[PDB]
Amino acid sequence: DYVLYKDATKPVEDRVADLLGRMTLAEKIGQMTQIERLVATPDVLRDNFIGSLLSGGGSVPRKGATAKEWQDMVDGFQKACMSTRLGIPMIYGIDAVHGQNNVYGATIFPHNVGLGATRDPYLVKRIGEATALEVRATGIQYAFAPCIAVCRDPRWGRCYESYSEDRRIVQSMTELIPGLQGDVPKDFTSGMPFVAGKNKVAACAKHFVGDGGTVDGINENNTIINREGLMNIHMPAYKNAMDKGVSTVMISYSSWNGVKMHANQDLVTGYLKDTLKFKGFVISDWEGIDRITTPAGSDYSYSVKASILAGLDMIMVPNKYQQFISILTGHVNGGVIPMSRIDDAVTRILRVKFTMGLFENPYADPAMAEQLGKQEHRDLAREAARKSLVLLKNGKTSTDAPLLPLPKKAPKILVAGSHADNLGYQCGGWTIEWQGDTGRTTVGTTILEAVKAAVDPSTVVVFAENPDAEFVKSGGFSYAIVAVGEHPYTETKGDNLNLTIPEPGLSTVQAVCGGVRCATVLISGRPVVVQPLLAASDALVAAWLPGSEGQGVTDALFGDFGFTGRLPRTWFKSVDQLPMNVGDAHYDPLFRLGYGLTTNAT
Numbered sequence: 001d002y003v004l005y006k007d008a009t010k011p012v013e014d015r016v017a018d019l020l021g022r023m024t025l026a027e028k029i030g031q032m033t034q035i036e037r038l039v040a041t042p043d044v045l046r047d048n049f050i051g052s053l054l055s056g057g058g059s060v061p062r063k064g065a066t067a068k069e070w071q072d073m074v075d076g077f078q079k080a081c082m083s084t085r086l087g088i089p090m091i092y093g094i095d096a097v098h099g100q101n102n103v104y105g106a107t108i109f110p111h112n113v114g115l116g117a118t119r120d121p122y123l124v125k126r127i128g129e130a131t132a133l134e135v136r137a138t139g140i141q142y143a144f145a146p147c148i149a150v151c152r153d154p155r156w157g158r159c160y161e162s163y164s165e166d167r168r169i170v171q172s173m174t175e176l177i178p179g180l181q182g183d184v185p186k187d188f189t190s191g192m193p194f195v196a197g198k199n200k201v202a203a204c205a206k207h208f209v210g211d212g213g214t215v216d217g218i219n220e221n222n223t224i225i226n227r228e229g230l231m232n233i234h235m236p237a238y239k240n241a242m243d244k245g246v247s248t249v250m251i252s253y254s255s256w257n258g259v260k261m262h263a264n265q266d267l268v269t270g271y272l273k274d275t276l277k278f279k280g281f282v283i284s285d286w287e288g289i290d291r292i293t294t295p296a297g298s299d300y301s302y303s304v305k306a307s308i309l310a311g312l313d314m315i316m317v318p319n320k321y322q323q324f325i326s327i328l329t330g331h332v333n334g335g336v337i338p339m340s341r342i343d344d345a346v347t348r349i350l351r352v353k354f355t356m357g358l359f360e361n362p363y364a365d366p367a368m369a370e371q372l373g374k375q376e377h378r379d380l381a382r383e384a385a386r387k388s389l390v391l392l393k394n395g396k397t398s399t400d401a402p403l404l405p406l407p408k409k410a411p412k413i414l415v416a417g418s419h420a421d422n423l424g425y426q427c428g429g430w431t432i433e434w435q436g437d438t439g440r441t442t443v444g445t446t447i448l449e450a451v452k453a454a455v456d457p458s459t460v461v462v463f464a465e466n467p468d469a470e471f472v473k474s475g476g477f478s479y480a481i482v483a484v485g486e487h488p489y490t491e492t493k494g495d496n497l498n499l500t501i502p503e504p505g506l507s508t509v510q511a512v513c514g515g516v517r518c519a520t521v522l523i524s525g526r527p528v529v530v531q532p533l534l535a536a537s538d539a540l541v542a543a544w545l546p547g548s549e550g551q552g553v554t555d556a557l558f559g560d561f562g563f564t565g566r567l568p569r570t571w572f573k574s575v576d577q578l579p580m581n582v583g584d585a586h587y588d589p590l591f592r593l594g595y596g597l598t599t600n601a602t
């Protein structure tokens with residue numbers, strides 16, 4: 001007999017309905033299940049009719065694996081899924097949040113805070129475009145991005161994953177979505193999922209909702225705000241995401257006024273689905289449903305009931321799939337979760353799969369492999385890094401000659417600091433490892449390498465990581481570039497109540513700037529206590545977490561391009577002011593949102 005869902009010429013909705021009507025309960029619950037590659041096996045995938053896989057942070061086939069190795073891994077999982085009775089392809093997800101960042105040799109773009117500084121939505125769209133290509137280079141069809149959190153407190157360990165404290169800037173940067181997925185048709189209905197085809201990926205607006213509003217920036221905590229505040233700060237960018245056809249939405253670990261987002265039917269079903277008319281699929285965060293309870297996981301049967309009844313479609317288990325499937329199956333068999341709820345989740349999952357062309361192109365394209373780390377994408381990252389830089393100081397007094405831009409020709413120059421020759425540090429979290437890492441973790445150019453690549457051949461470049469004052473004074477240097485700042489972190493590891501950079505950092509800046517005029521490059525995921533750094537420095541640049549292309553930094557330092565970045569966040573005078581955002585009644589910033597000095601290209 002003719003099988004409608006297998007017919008590529010049929011409308012998505014007909015294909016969805018035709019497939020759904022054929023599915024057993026096990027096949028339906030299987031679709032709703034996302035598992036980590038580390039627990040996946042061909043038998044597991046086949047026997048449990050698994051709908052999706054993911055790589056968590058740092059979950060890779062091998063250290064240094066090529067694009068083809070990733071393709072082979074993903075395809076191996078896909079072959080198993082395609083061998084089921086109905087042959088429903090799995091969708092493979094990954095945190096490609098500043099490039100395809102788990103992957104060795106992938107272009108690493110500036111983190112979102114830096115992108116906010118660019119005020120350039122089209123640049124971000126292009127980044128989305130390049131990111132989709134490098135994700136597809138690895139056979140992966142789904143990126144967990146953009147994070148459209150509006151970070152209202154930089155003590156949050158994920159503040160770097162927010163474009164801004166200003167929702168208007170976050171809204172503008174939702175242009176990442178049509179970059180990743182492709183532009184929606186002119187006829188498009190807001191809330192429908194969209195992916196253009198096999199050279200694009202499904203995107204994910206995360207984390208719904210108010211993830212950036214938690215008390216004291218405590219990760220995964222309580223967002224205490226009235227409905228008006230939630231709706232005017234934390235919600236707006238989700239509506240833009242609907243308008244641009246975002247395929248999926250991930251739920252936040254956080255709570256709203258003490259209500260776990262993963263158990264919030266009013267917001268997930270009442271608002272996202274029933275008001276915004278979201279028609280893609282809603283996915284949990286990693287063990288997000290376990291974390292509904294205190295302690296986490298102490299009543300998993302409740303977790304499943306609450307989350308599924310709340311309106312979640314796909315669960316990022318990601319390990320204990322047997323318990324998830326068993327419990328959900330029991331709930332359906334006992335009438336606690338109605339078939340209609342299951343049918344809704346599967347309809348949404350399938351709609352996204354059919355829409356993106358997954359049934360027609362379930363396997364990787366080996367011709368895409370060379371998109372990974374492709375030089376054009378690095379040139380784009382280099383542009384973004386440069387645009388992201390915020391110049392905070394350029395001369396100690398009103399009558400001083402501006403230090404920047406620096407001349408490329410000088411007898412001898414000093415490059416110094418813990419962050420001057422450390423690729424891992426300049427990339428920050430979500431790079432190679434979940435938490436990021438130190439040193440030469442991938443392909444890129446450090447600030448020191450960038451300096452050496454930029455200067456006149458007659459310019460002697462000296463590197464000293466932590467030179468003492470005497471070395472500097474005796475060195476015969478024309479000037480110094482000194483780079484310091486935060487170490488890589490991700491999620492809760494980044495929560496920080498004092499926001500002072502680790503030492504040696506300040507001490508190195510003081511020692512260097514004491515001996516020669518200095519340009520201080522601050523690498524951070526957020527504003528940090530900066531007055532002492534400012535006081536020591538002739539010039540100081542907030543470079544955020546600029547990624548693999550350190551030449552973006554030197555492009556501005558040496559005057560190939562003028563500084564144009566403007567603060568996307570308030571720079572506080574002290575942490576005891578926090579939270580403190582633009583528009584507050586008591587607004588007393590060191591630098592207001594939007595501040596930035598400029599230079600002209602030499």
Ligand SMILES: *[C@@H]1O[C@H](CO)[C@@H](O[C@@H]2O[C@H](CO)[C@@H](O[C@@H]3O[C@H](CO)[C@@H](O)[C@H](O)[C@@H]3O)[C@H](O)[C@H]2NC(C)=O)[C@H](O[C@@H]2O[C@@H](C)[C@@H](O)[C@@H](O)[C@@H]2O)[C@H]1NC(C)=O
Nearest residue numbers: 118119120121561562563564565596597598599600601602
């Ligand atoms: C010297 O460097 C300054 C940097 O501020 C340049 O002035 C600035 O030109 C920018 C355009 O390159 C303007 O930025 C704005 O950007 C947003 C978003 O990208 C746009 O929506 C908006 O329309 C602007 O383009 C900015 O307004 C301007 N800043 C000020 C106050 O001067 C300057 O560029 C030159 O002068 C300005 C006034 C413009 O006429 C530019 O077209 C022109 O290139 C730089 N001067 C030189 C010699 O290059």
Ligand SMILES: *[C@@H]1O[C@H](CO)[C@@H](O[C@@H]2O[C@H](CO)[C@@H](O[C@@H]3O[C@H](CO)[C@@H](O)[C@H](O)[C@@H]3O)[C@H](O)[C@H]2NC(C)=O)[C@H](O)[C@H]1NC(C)=O
Nearest residue numbers: 218219220221222223253254255256258259260294295296
């Ligand atoms: C927001 O963050 C705060 C601070 O972490 C959370 O409060 C803390 O909640 C945990 C429960 O997981 C408490 O730990 C427990 O303490 C009791 C002490 O008798 C102990 O018997 C348990 O073994 C466990 O360690 C912790 O005390 C508590 N701390 C504070 C400062 O209140 C809060 O739950 C978070 N809120 C949300 C909505 O996520």
Ligand SMILES: CCCCCCCCO[C@@H]1O[C@H](CO)[C@@H](O)[C@H](O)[C@H]1O
Nearest residue numbers: 055056057095144206285286491492
């Ligand atoms: C103390 C809190 C422990 C956090 C452990 C959870 C690690 C995963 O964290 C989550 O994982 C998803 C998939 O990788 C990401 O897309 C989400 O943005 C992230 O919140």
Ligand SMILES: *[C@@H]1O[C@H](CO)[C@@H](O)[C@H](O)[C@H]1NC(C)=O
Nearest residue numbers: 494495496497498499500502
């Ligand atoms: C401030 O907090 C962070 C995170 O807890 C910590 O790493 C840092 O060392 C702290 N600074 C000091 C000196 O207390």
